[PDB]
């Protein structure tokens, strides 16, 4: 059976990026903004029964749900002409005002309040499908509303249905600047602890490098959140491309994630895509540019004295290519030794050939999206942990977590989150060395 994936749009930023993703999918499949089939959408090979369910009137209704604690973003999305894409049953209107004030505690408590008011919808969307491969959760860890809500919902779903793939699209706040919500790192830390406890494969989405590419690779003096969301939706929708080609390999998300993840705690994957533009390329150019630390969407700290090993390297290559090109590109990159692997469990650089949809306007021969399990992100975690630690050193803005009595009773939840993150970072450090078998 064709397993589906359910989309969870949370928070202002998560809802925005989820809409961007869904519009990108609609563009790829070639369907009308109402979700009705077109003369150039159904005559191809792309399988549109993976994220959209076919109706009885050729309506590929998206397998997505809209949740928020403030209805204004919901109304704005409704104003879009892609409101006809979704069913109203697929949409829940916020019964809360002002979101959760961007507080992890507030969002978590409100998600606890709406336990079944979301559970009913999720169960309806689930049992409406034969089999589901897993879940996809678009969210922003910066937004405390969505952060707490997602933590609650991840707990609930992991408890109730321990039989699906748990994926979240965690918007990582900018390290380029400090936001007015100074307790944002703790919220993120709590969310990160939940991810460590619950999530299975994390595609990290740092806003700092997004800003950097936008300023440089999109050439804007002041990037806007909307254009950033547009570009990130484009780059993330490029991921599922292999899933849309049922002609080469099984290519199931569960297996693809499992082909790289060593442990359910070490489930964090980088991102990197080419081309980025506001010409002529061969296979060897693809990974050759990917090796450059210029097209990564995930940045790390200022660390240069600690070796970092790319635990797993994979690349999806969308475009018309030749098998000899891939065969030689792999050997050539390996001989140039532009990568590393664990000495005890040494691995290789997996490739995924795929071809472009005819309904996708093509202006380039190839397009590459990298998936790397790597150690640099620990620095970012450290960057957060330090940001947490000093904040926890300052013991500032804890009244936000004293509004909700759950944290007013004890801040030991933050301490346990910090401990778990430290354990994970030490796990990464050990993974850098052959002794990881002992750890």
């Amino acid at each position: 059976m064709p397993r589906e994936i359910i989309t969870l749009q949370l928070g202002q930023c998560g809802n925005q990026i989820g809409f961007e993703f869904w519009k990108q999918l609609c563009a790829e499949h070639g369907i009308s903004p109402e979700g009705i089939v077109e003369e150039f959408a159904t005559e191809g090979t792309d399988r549109k029964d993976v994220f959209f369910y076919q109706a009885d009137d050729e309506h590929y209704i998206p397998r997505a749900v809209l949740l928020d604690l403030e209805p204004r973003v919901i109304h704005s999305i409704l104003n879009s002409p892609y409101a006809k894409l979704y069913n109203p049953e697929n949409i829940y209107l916020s019964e809360h005002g002002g979101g959760a004030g961007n507080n992890w505690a507030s969002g978590f408590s409100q998600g606890e309040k709406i336990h079944e008011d979301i559970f009913d919808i999720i169960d309806r969307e689930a049992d409406g499908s034969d089999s589901l491969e897993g879940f996809v959760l678009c969210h922003s860890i910066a937004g405390g509303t969505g952060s707490g809500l997602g933590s609650y919902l991840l707990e609930r779903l992991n408890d109730r249905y321990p039989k699906k793939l748990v994926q979240t699209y965690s918007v990582f706040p900018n390290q380029d600047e400090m936001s007015d919500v100074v307790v944002q790192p703790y919220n993120s830390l709590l969310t990160l602890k939940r991810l460590t406890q619950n999530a299975d494969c994390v595609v990290v989405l740092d806003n700092t490098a997004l800003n950097r590419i936008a300023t440089d690779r999109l050439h804007i003096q002041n990037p806007s959140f909307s254009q950033i969301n547009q570009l990130v939706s484009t780059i993330m929708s490029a991921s599922t491309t292999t899933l849309r080609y049922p002609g080469y390999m099984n290519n199931d998300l569960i297996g693809l994630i499992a082909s790289l993840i060593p442990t359910p705690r070490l489930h964090f994957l980088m991102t990197g895509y080419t081309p980025l533009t506001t010409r002529k390329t061969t296979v060897l150019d693809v990974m050759r540019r990917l090796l450059q630390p210029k097209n990564v969407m995930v940045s790390t700290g200022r660390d240069r004295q600690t070796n970092h090993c790319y635990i797993a390297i994979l690349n999806i290559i969308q475009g018309e290519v030749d098998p000899t090109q891939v065969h030689k590109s792999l050997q050539r990159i390996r001989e140039r030794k532009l990568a590393n692997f664990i000495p005890w469990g040494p691995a290789s650089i997996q490739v995924a050939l795929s071809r472009k949809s005819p309904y996708l306007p093509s202006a380039h021969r190839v397009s590459g999206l990298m998936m790397a399990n790597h150690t640099s992100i620990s620095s970012l975690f450290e960057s957060s942990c330090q940001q947490y630690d000093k904040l926890r050193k300052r013991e500032a803005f804890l009244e936000q977590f004293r509004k909700e009595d759950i944290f007013k009773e004890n801040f030991d939840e933050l301490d346990r989150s910090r401990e778990v993150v430290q354990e994970l970072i030490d796990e990464y450090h050990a993974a850098t060395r052959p002794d990881y078998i002992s750890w």
């Binding site: 059976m1 399988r47 002609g247 290519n251 499992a258």
Partner: protein, 211 residues
Amino acid sequence: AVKADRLWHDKYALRKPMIPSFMTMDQCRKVLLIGKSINFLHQVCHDQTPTTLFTDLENAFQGKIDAAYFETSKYLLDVLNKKYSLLDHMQAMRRYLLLGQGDFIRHLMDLLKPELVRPATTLYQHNLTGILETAVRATNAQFDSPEILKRLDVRLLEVSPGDTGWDVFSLDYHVDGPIATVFTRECMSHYLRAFNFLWRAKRVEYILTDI
């Protein structure tokens, strides 16, 4: 002796000691191919299409030979690739018999897991054919040509005496007559062997994924 399968060497043999001094080996091969194509078209394709230096060797003899050869061959190629057989059949066995589908094969082995675990003796192709057809209706193969769909067929291919049904399961994809006169029921044997090889490989892959 006459046949409809092997009629690429059947009832048309080249006689070595019966060639004129003005008749050459390549000319003989070309004329044999042209005549065999005409015979196949009129007999196995059941299509009736009209075929319109002095010395004693000439040069227009060879020119006529070549022109008629290219006419006959091109016409028969068009006939065979347009009606009856199609290139899409090879693409079809590429998609299906070469495990290009994936989801088709994935769900196929998903449904076979509850069955092929049972002993090979305890199995019933009666239910296996229904499994096949319902999976095809489930998957994208339902969106493909019904001719290739009818060309498919599941078989119970004896592999183990009383072992698991994973071994004895097979597909046959019967194709006969002027449709895919080729493969002589000797290349399809190799195709079946490769199918078994890839089937075992994919099964153990899915085992690893499940683990």
